[PDB]
Design an enzyme around this catalytic site. Structure first.
Site, PDB file in Angstrom:
ATOM      1  N   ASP A  72      15.464  21.376 -10.200  1.00 31.31           N
ATOM      2  CA  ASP A  72      15.408  20.271 -11.151  1.00 31.31           C
ATOM      3  C   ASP A  72      14.042  20.262 -11.822  1.00 31.31           C
ATOM      4  O   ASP A  72      13.091  19.672 -11.305  1.00 31.31           O
ATOM      5  CB  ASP A  72      15.682  18.946 -10.445  1.00 31.31           C
ATOM      6  N   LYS A 109      12.853  18.544 -14.158  1.00 28.79           N
ATOM      7  CA  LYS A 109      12.734  17.331 -14.945  1.00 28.79           C
ATOM      8  C   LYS A 109      11.296  17.166 -15.428  1.00 28.79           C
ATOM      9  O   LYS A 109      10.357  17.416 -14.666  1.00 28.79           O
ATOM     10  CB  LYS A 109      13.149  16.124 -14.104  1.00 28.79           C
ATOM     11  CG  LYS A 109      12.982  14.788 -14.792  1.00 28.79           C
ATOM     12  CD  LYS A 109      13.251  13.634 -13.846  1.00 28.79           C
ATOM     13  CE  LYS A 109      13.488  12.352 -14.624  1.00 28.79           C
ATOM     14  NZ  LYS A 109      12.488  12.164 -15.714  1.00 28.79           N
ATOM     15  N   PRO A 110      11.081  16.751 -16.678  1.00 26.89           N
ATOM     16  CA  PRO A 110       9.706  16.508 -17.143  1.00 26.89           C
ATOM     17  C   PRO A 110       8.948  15.466 -16.334  1.00 26.89           C
ATOM     18  O   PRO A 110       7.751  15.275 -16.574  1.00 26.89           O
ATOM     19  CB  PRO A 110       9.906  16.058 -18.594  1.00 26.89           C
ATOM     20  CG  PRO A 110      11.166  16.713 -19.004  1.00 26.89           C
ATOM     21  CD  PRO A 110      12.045  16.718 -17.787  1.00 26.89           C
ATOM     22  N   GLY A 147       0.824  -1.190   0.000  1.00 30.10           N
ATOM     23  CA  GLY A 147       0.000   0.000   0.000  1.00 30.10           C
ATOM     24  C   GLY A 147       0.861   1.244   0.000  1.00 30.10           C
ATOM     25  O   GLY A 147       0.775   2.069   0.913  1.00 30.10           O
ATOM     26  N   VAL A 148       1.701   1.380  -1.029  1.00 26.73           N
ATOM     27  CA  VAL A 148       2.694   2.449  -1.051  1.00 26.73           C
ATOM     28  C   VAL A 148       2.031   3.820  -1.129  1.00 26.73           C
ATOM     29  O   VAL A 148       2.618   4.822  -0.704  1.00 26.73           O
ATOM     30  CB  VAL A 148       3.689   2.222  -2.207  1.00 26.73           C
ATOM     31  CG1 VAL A 148       3.059   2.570  -3.548  1.00 26.73           C
ATOM     32  CG2 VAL A 148       4.965   3.019  -1.979  1.00 26.73           C
ATOM     33  N   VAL A 149       0.815   3.897  -1.664  1.00 29.60           N
ATOM     34  CA  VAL A 149       0.073   5.148  -1.739  1.00 29.60           C
ATOM     35  C   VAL A 149      -1.387   4.882  -1.421  1.00 29.60           C
ATOM     36  O   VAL A 149      -1.966   3.895  -1.886  1.00 29.60           O
ATOM     37  CB  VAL A 149       0.207   5.811  -3.121  1.00 29.60           C
ATOM     38  CG1 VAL A 149       1.512   6.565  -3.214  1.00 29.60           C
ATOM     39  CG2 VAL A 149       0.123   4.761  -4.202  1.00 29.60           C
ATOM     40  N   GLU A 155      -2.371  17.503  -3.210  1.00 28.97           N
ATOM     41  CA  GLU A 155      -3.370  17.478  -4.266  1.00 28.97           C
ATOM     42  C   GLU A 155      -2.991  16.420  -5.292  1.00 28.97           C
ATOM     43  O   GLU A 155      -1.816  16.106  -5.483  1.00 28.97           O
ATOM     44  CB  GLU A 155      -3.486  18.846  -4.936  1.00 28.97           C
ATOM     45  CG  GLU A 155      -4.776  19.039  -5.714  1.00 28.97           C
ATOM     46  CD  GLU A 155      -4.575  19.793  -7.012  1.00 28.97           C
ATOM     47  OE1 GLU A 155      -3.537  20.469  -7.150  1.00 28.97           O
ATOM     48  OE2 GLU A 155      -5.457  19.713  -7.894  1.00 28.97           O
ATOM     49  N   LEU A 176      -2.756  14.993  -9.040  1.00 25.63           N
ATOM     50  CA  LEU A 176      -2.666  15.303 -10.458  1.00 25.63           C
ATOM     51  C   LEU A 176      -2.418  14.012 -11.226  1.00 25.63           C
ATOM     52  O   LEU A 176      -1.628  13.166 -10.796  1.00 25.63           O
ATOM     53  CB  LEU A 176      -1.555  16.315 -10.728  1.00 25.63           C
ATOM     54  CG  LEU A 176      -1.911  17.778 -10.456  1.00 25.63           C
ATOM     55  CD1 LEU A 176      -0.733  18.510  -9.852  1.00 25.63           C
ATOM     56  CD2 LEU A 176      -2.357  18.462 -11.735  1.00 25.63           C
TER      57      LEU A 176
END
Lengths: 72, 258, 284
Positions: free
Chosen positions: C114, C116-117, C3-5, C68, C70
């Site tokens: 950074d 980074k995309p 359950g990492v998130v 939040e 996304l």
């Protein structure tokens, strides 16, 4: 070395270690509610407490990697 | 950044009031006195000089205590704990390599165990609501420095000295905002070494005039003239070194015409 | 691990929150610096182009941050969109939005490092937001923060690779220019294997940094005069599918002089940004 000459200097004499420990502990575990109930989540042991919020399990895919990035 | 400088100054001015201690917050404390806060800050400076810490940490650290002692009570015994945890939380925000906890425990002569310095920084980070970025008297002199002639030495070092002398005494420097204390510090060293008064460049940018710093100037001169006779002499020794142009040995001006 | 998130939607017509967990060893240095800095600098920032740190909770051995939610990062979206290419209106939208957030951050005394995309988050509404603020460090003036060389290699400014003493606000503009130039062609412009080959990949396109274009390069540390005499590539070939207006902006924002690179608050009035509207991506 016998400890640093200027910095190492006790300031206000002796203290009570036991009373200090319990005073810190109380307040450490007092931090609950108004967030545990606002987010209706059992933050103590990562438990999705029941409530209006719909906590869900998410696989590492189909999700940005920002949410499971290990610290470096 | 001359593109964003105006907005940065306006934001700093707006934020200077939120991250402010309440005036006269401590007389309510039933165990500590100003002679203890001065001693604590003196010890803080002595530690900072013996760990090669950046000067921004000190100004930050003594801020957190001011926002902590005025929100949650503390006993006499564990005040050094508050100071040590304040240094720990300040150094992990402004220093490139934060010193380890064991070193800080070693500094206080092994009176607080390693598990004791923690569980206090645990406490401090929640009473302030994790709002550690607080504008202070270093972040304001930096903006004011780039208008006192393109090249002027021994001004950006005595001004720092007068800014640091502020933290030692709570009375009466706990009323003025950091933006007024910095302005008084900048217009005292400048008169000391160069001669020119409050610059016209910074009297149409910051909005303050030389009249609305008169209380701050008269408060700062007394400390300037008594610093050699203060009971906590560590900042004077710290600025005696040649790193800061040795301004600590300059003769204080006697009188003013402000 | 498993359950990492714990992503939690709202039933009372609310936003979607997500949980980021940080495990505290509580053995040395207490809470890490990389958490304190991000938490402190992500609460002063409130823009419609930045992730909102909705909540922070700190227990005896864990630290939760409620963010939040996304949907899709830019990297995976552009990987899935490589076949058809990012449409010109969509990239115009994703530039007019990120530049706003970067200008807001720079005006708020906070410096991003950074870009980074993978650190840019988009959603179904067409919005875009800066995500990772761990390396962010407040400056006040660019002469306060030192150098530690932590930012990702493919998106380092030519000033950082050569070694400086203080940062500036041009690092973010350089990274933003790289991302802009890179989503038009769907190819990382400068994928160097190390710092030296990264430098040799930068020189191939923009020409050798002569003292005429860069006043402060000759005395710069880690600069040598034994550098290849590579020509300045014509920009008509570096990015073919750009319009007449977009020729200048990519060149100004990719400039060499750290005091010349066009500022984000000034990039919004450049004639490229004249008619920008936000479409919706491929289901985020």
């Amino acid at each position: 070395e016998h400890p640093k000459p200027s910095a190492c200097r006790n300031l206000f004499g002796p203290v009570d270690h036991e009373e200090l420990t319990r005073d810190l502990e109380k307040h450490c575990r007092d931090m609950e509610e108004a967030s545990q109930r606002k987010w209706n989540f059992d933050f103590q042991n990562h438990k999705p407490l029941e409530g209006k919020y719909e906590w869900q399990e998410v696989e590492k895919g189909s999700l940005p990697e920002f949410y499971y990035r290990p610290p470096r | 950044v001359p593109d964003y400088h105006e907005d940065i100054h306006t934001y700093l001015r707006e934020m200077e009031v939120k991250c402010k201690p309440k005036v006269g917050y401590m007389k309510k404390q039933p165990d500590i006195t100003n002679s203890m806060r001065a001693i604590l800050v003196d010890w803080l400076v002595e530690v900072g000089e013996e760990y090669k810490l950046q000067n921004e940490t000190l100004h930050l650290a003594v801020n957190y205590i001011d926002r902590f002692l005025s929100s949650m009570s503390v006993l006499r015994g564990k005040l050094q704990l508050v100071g040590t945890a304040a240094m720990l939380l300040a150094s992990k925000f402004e220093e490139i390599y934060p010193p380890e906890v064991a070193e800080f425990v070693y500094i206080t002569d092994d009176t607080y165990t390693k598990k004791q310095v923690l569980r206090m920084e645990h406490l401090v980070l929640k009473v302030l609501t994790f709002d550690l970025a607080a504008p202070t008297v270093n972040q304001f002199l930096t903006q004011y420095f780039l208008h006192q002639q393109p090249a002027n030495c021994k001004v950006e070092s005595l001004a720092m000295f007068l800014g640091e002398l502020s933290l030692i005494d709570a009375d009466p420097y706990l009323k003025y905002l950091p933006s007024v204390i910095a302005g008084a510090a900048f217009h005292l060293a400048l008169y000391t070494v160069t001669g020119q008064s409050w610059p016209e460049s910074l009297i149409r940018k910051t909005g303050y005039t030389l009249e609305s710093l008169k209380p701050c100037l008269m408060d700062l001169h007394q400390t300037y003239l008594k610093a050699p006779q203060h009971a906590q002499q560590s900042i004077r020794e710290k600025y005696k070194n040649s790193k800061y142009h040795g301004v600590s040995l300059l003769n204080p001006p006697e009188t003013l015409n402000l | 691990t498993y359950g990492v998130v714990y992503k939690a939607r709202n039933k009372l017509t609310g936003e979607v929150v997500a949980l980021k967990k940080i495990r505290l060893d509580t053995e040395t240095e207490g809470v890490p610096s990389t958490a304190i800095r991000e938490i402190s600098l992500l609460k002063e920032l409130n823009h419609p182009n930045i992730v909102k740190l909705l909540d922070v909770i700190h227990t005896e051995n864990k630290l939760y941050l409620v963010f939040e939610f996304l949907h899709q990062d830019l990297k995976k979206f552009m990987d899935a969109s490589a076949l058809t290419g990012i449409p010109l209106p969509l990239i115009k939208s994703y530039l007019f939005q990120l530049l706003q957030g970067l200008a807001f951050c720079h005006s708020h005394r906070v410096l991003h490092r950074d870009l980074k995309p993978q650190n840019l988050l988009i959603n179904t509404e067409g919005a875009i937001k800066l995500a990772d603020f761990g390396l962010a460090r407040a400056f006040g003036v660019p002469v306060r923060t030192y150098t530690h060389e932590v930012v990702t290699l493919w998106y380092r400014a030519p000033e950082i690779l050569l070694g400086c003493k203080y940062y500036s606000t041009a690092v973010d503009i350089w990274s933003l220019g790289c991302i802009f130039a890179e989503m038009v062609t769907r190819r990382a412009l400068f994928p160097g294997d190390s710092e030296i080959d990264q430098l040799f990949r930068i020189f191939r396109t923009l020409g050798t940094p002569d003292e005429v274009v860069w006043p402060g390069v000759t005395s710069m540390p880690d600069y040598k005069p034994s550098f290849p005499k590579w020509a300045r590539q014509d920009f008509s070939k570096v990015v073919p599918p750009l319009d007449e207006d977009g020729r200048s902006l990519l060149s100004q924002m990719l400039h060499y002089d750290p005091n010349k690179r066009i500022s984000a608050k000034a990039a919004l009035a450049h004639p490229f940004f004249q008619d920008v509207t936000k479409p919706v991506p491929h289901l985020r």
